Design a protein around this ligand. Structure first.
Ligand SMILES: Nc1nc2c3ccc(NCCO)cc3nc(Cc3ccc4c(c3)OCO4)n2n1
Length: 207
């Protein structure tokens, strides 16, 4: 279990997301599905010059798994996955320039629903989650669990859970006031309104 500090900018974005009054929380779901869609484009893309990159699983899709018992909503994709270096270095680099641009727009008229246009939509998960655990597997690397409850830090460990093949699970530990996002009907309403044209199948699991 290693512990790392976020860069100043990302930490500050994360507190803004957590502390600002903003009632339209539901946009988190569009952002994570859109992240999954991008990760699926990326695996489909690299496999064009190396078809063996699909040995770890051919199917390209997304599952939404609510669990009232654990109070979690998990978004699962078989996209390209993230390496250790992504989790500790590259994602932070991407998040730095994206945060700055998002900040500039926010003070000049924009709102939190436009976060995905700046490449930092993942952090919108913190509108509804007190803790996010991300389990990720990339092709020539091991399986990792990343985890953060914000407050300026995150952890990374080699994951010993069930091996997952290739891709990412984002596990959202929902705040107590946000269990609406565990309801089939709420989720289905949200997918229909904001995520109806994704180029990969999306399956909504029932409890
Ligand atoms: N499902 C999925 N797949 C990817 C993903 C897959 C590949 C990738 N490549 C990074 C450049 O090598 C970046 C990615 N970024 C995100 C967004 C993301 C951004 C920040 C994150 C995070 C995920 O988990 C922990 O912190 N996702 N989300």
């Amino acid at each position: 279990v290693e512990t790392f500090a976020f860069q100043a900018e990302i930490a500050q974005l994360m507190s803004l997301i957590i502390n600002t009054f903003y009632s339209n929380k539901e946009i988190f779901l569009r952002e994570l599905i859109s992240n999954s869609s991008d990760a699926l484009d990326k695996i489909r893309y690299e496999s064009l010059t190396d078809p063996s990159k699909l040995d770890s699983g051919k199917e390209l899709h997304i599952n939404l798994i609510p669990n009232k018992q654990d109070r979690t909503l998990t978004i699962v994709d078989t996209g390209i996955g993230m390496t250790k270096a992504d989790l500790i270095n590259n994602l932070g680099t991407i998040a730095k320039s994206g945060t700055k641009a998002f900040m500039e727009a926010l003070q000049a008229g924009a709102d939190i629903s436009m976060i995905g246009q700046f490449g930092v939509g993942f952090y919108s998960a913190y509108l509804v989650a007190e803790k996010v655990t991300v389990i990720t597997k990339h092709n020539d690397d091991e399986q990792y669990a990343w985890e953060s409850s914000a407050g300026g830090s995150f952890t990374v460990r080699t994951d010993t859970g069930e091996p997952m093949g290739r891709g990412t699970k984002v596990i959202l530990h929902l705040k107590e006031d946000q269990t609406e996002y565990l309801e089939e009907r709420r989720i289905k309403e949200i997918v229909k309104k904001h995520s109806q044209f994704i180029g990969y199948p999306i399956t909504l699991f029932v409890e």
